[PDB]
Design an enzyme around this catalytic site. Structure first.
Site: not given
Ligand SMILES: OCc1ccccc1
Ligand SMILES: [Zn+2]
Length: 256
Positions: A91, A103, A116
Site C-alpha cells: 500500500h 512517513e 510499503h
C-alpha cells in the site's frame, strides 16, 4: 475510530493504542549522517518473479494490493533478515500536496508518497501470529517523488476508479511488483512498528535510499480516493501518513 482527521489523527491514537508512545515506534526520521554503514549486513534478496496478486482493496485508510501468501512465491530475505518473509500486501501513504506524504523522512525531507511492501516471517505460520513477534514482519519502504511517470504503477492507477470508497474491492491479478522497485537496493534498516493501529512493534524496517519517480497525474489519482464509504459525506483520502516518531534507543544501519 482512528483515522487521519483533526479529531482522530495520529496524536489521538495513544488513547486506544498506548503502544503509540512505545520504545520502537515507526516511522522515524532517517538522519543520514548518524546512520552507520554495517558491513555485517548481507545483500538484500527480493524474489518477486512468482508473485501472485489477487485483489486491490480500499480499507478506509489506504488501498492494499493483496497477494496469495499460502506458498513461497514472492519472498524477501537477506539484508538484516534471518529467515524468509512472504509478501502479503503493499500500500502507499501520500499527501494532499507533493511536498508531503511520506512517513519516513530523510534528514527531515518529506517525499510525495511512500510505498510499503509487507512481508511476514514464515517461521510463524501466518500473518496474524507474526505480528505478535518482535521479528514477525519485514516491510520494504520505497519513497516516491513527482517527476517522470512510473510505467509499472499505471495498472494500479487505472483501477482506483473502481474502489473509490471504503470497503470496495476489485480483482487485481497478474500485477508484477517488480515494476515498483528502484534500480538500486541500497537501504537503511532499523527495528520498528506498524505505522497504523494497532502499532505493534513487530517490524524490521528496510527503507530504500533510491526513490522511484511517479508522475503528477499518477499521484493526482491517488488523491481522488475516499476515506469514507459510499453514500457517506466525501472526505478525500489524502495525508494518510503518520509523522516521524522518537528514535529513542535505536540505531539506523546503512547497507552502503
Ligand atoms: O506499517 C507497516 C504495516 C504492515 C502491516 C499492517 C499495518 C502496517
Ligand atoms: Zn504503510
Amino acid at each position: 475510530h482512528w483515522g487521519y482527521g483533526k479529531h482522530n489523527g495520529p496524536e489521538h491514537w495513544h488513547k486506544d493504542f498506548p503502544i503509540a508512545k512505545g520504545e520502537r515506534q515507526s516511522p522515524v526520521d532517517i538522519d543520514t549522517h548518524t546512520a552507520k554503514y554495517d558491513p555485517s549486513l548481507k545483500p538484500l534478496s527480493v524474489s518477486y518473479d512468482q508473485a501472485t496478486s489477487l485483489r486491490i482493496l480500499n480499507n478506509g485508510h489506504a488501498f492494499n494490493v493483496e497477494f496469495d501468501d499460502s506458498q513461497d512465491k514472492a519472498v524477501l530475505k537477506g539484508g538484516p533478515l534471518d529467515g524468509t518473509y512472504r509478501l502479503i500486501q503493499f500500500h502507499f501513504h501520500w499527501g494532499s500536496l507533493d511536498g508531503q506524504g511520506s512517513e519516513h523522512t530523510v534528514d527531515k525531507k518529506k517525499y510525495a508518497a511512500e510505498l510499503h511492501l509487507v512481508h511476514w516471517n514464515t517461521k510463524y505460520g501466518d500473518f496474524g501470529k507474526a505480528v505478535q513477534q518482535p521479528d514477525g514482519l519485514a516491510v520494504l519502504g520505497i519513497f516516491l517523488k513527482v517527476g517522470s511517470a512510473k510505467p509499472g504503477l499505471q495498472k494500479v492507477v487505472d483501477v482506483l476508479d473502481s474502489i473509490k470508497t471504503k470497503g470496495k474491492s476489485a480483482d487485481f491479478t497478474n500485477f508484477d511488483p517488480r515494476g515498483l522497485l528502484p534500480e538500486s537496493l541500497d537501504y537503511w534498516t532499523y527495528p520498528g512498528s506498524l505505522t497504523t493501529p494497532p502499532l505493534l512493534e513487530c517490524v524490521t524496517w528496510i527503507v530504500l535510499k533510491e526513490p522511484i519517480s511517479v508522475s503528477s497525474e499518477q499521484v493526482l489519482k491517488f488523491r481522488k480516493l475516499n476515506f469514507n464509504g459510499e453514500g457517506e459525506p466525501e472526505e478525500l483520502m489524502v495525508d494518510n501518513w503518520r509523522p516521524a516518531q522518537p528514535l529513542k534507543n535505536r540505531q539506523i544501519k546503512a547497507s552502503f
